[PDB]
Amino acid sequence: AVSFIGSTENDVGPSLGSYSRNLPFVYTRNKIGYQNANVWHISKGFCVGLDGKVDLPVVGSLDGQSIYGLTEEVGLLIWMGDTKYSRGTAMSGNSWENVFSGWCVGANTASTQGLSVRVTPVILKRNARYSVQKTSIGSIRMRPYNGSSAGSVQTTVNFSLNPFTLND
């Protein structure tokens, strides 16, 4: 079986966080991110993976992944995937992308499916500080497989980037 145990709306990074450091200039570890190991409760042979989607406009790329725009001065590199940050999938484009191939819980056991979102600020153009307001990032949806079904359970959660400031 499967049930939604997370939050529909999720903020990425601490509110009003401040970060210090040619163009494009990339900054922040997992500081600006959201992580939750328990978003869906799964059991009895349920198989599930994750799809991720970024709604921000694409304004450039770096080493194979999109640079998403926030302001004409600030951009973002984004990763979505399974719970642990190191397993994040670098995001490109604005379509739903497979960000976690998935796994199946035991035939007679219960566990959970989590996720993580991480971003790193990028200075596209310069002015001394750069501020960013609360902005919608995108979403992540569970992807059942092997015949498993989501039934009427909530499959998608959304993410918003909390406001932050970048200091040169």
Ligand X SMILES: CO[C@@H]1O[C@H](CO)[C@@H](O)[C@H](O)[C@H]1NC(C)=O
Query: Binding residue per annotation — 33?
Result: no
Shortest distance in whole angstroms from residue 91 CB to ligand X? 18
Q: State which of residues 103, 141, 160, 162 lies at the interface with ligand X (CB under 6 A).
A: 103
Nearest to 54 by CA among 88, 17, 26, 29: 88
Among positions 107-146, residues that touch ligand X (CB under 6 A) are 111-114
Decide: 58 and 154 in contact? Cβ < 8 Å: no
Q: What's 57's DSSP letter?
A: P
Does 33 bind ligand X (CB under 6 A)? Our answer is no
Shortest distance in whole angstroms from residue 84 CB to ligand X? 7
Query: Binding residue per annotation — 7?
Result: no
Shortest distance in whole angstroms from residue 116 CB to ligand X? 9
Find tokens 């190191």 and name the residue: 86
Q: Where are the beta strands (DSSP E) in the chain?
A: 2-4, 9-12, 17-20, 25-26, 33-43, 47-54, 58-62, 65-69, 74-81, 88-90, 97-104, 110-123, 129-132, 135-144, 156-161, 164-167
From 6-14, 20-28, 63-71, 105-113, span contacting ligand X (CB under 6 A) = 105-113
Decide: 118 and 76 in contact? Cβ < 8 Å: no
Q: State which of residues 37, 47, 150, 153 lies at the interface with ligand X (CB under 6 A).
A: 37
Instruction: Please enumerate, by residue number, every residue annotated as part of a binding site.
Output: 37-38, 82-83, 111-114
| Residues lying near ligand X in the complex (CB under 6 A) | 37-38, 82-83, 103, 111-114
Instruction: Please enumerate, by residue number, every residue annotated as part of a binding site for a carbohydrate.
Output: 37-38, 82-83, 111-114
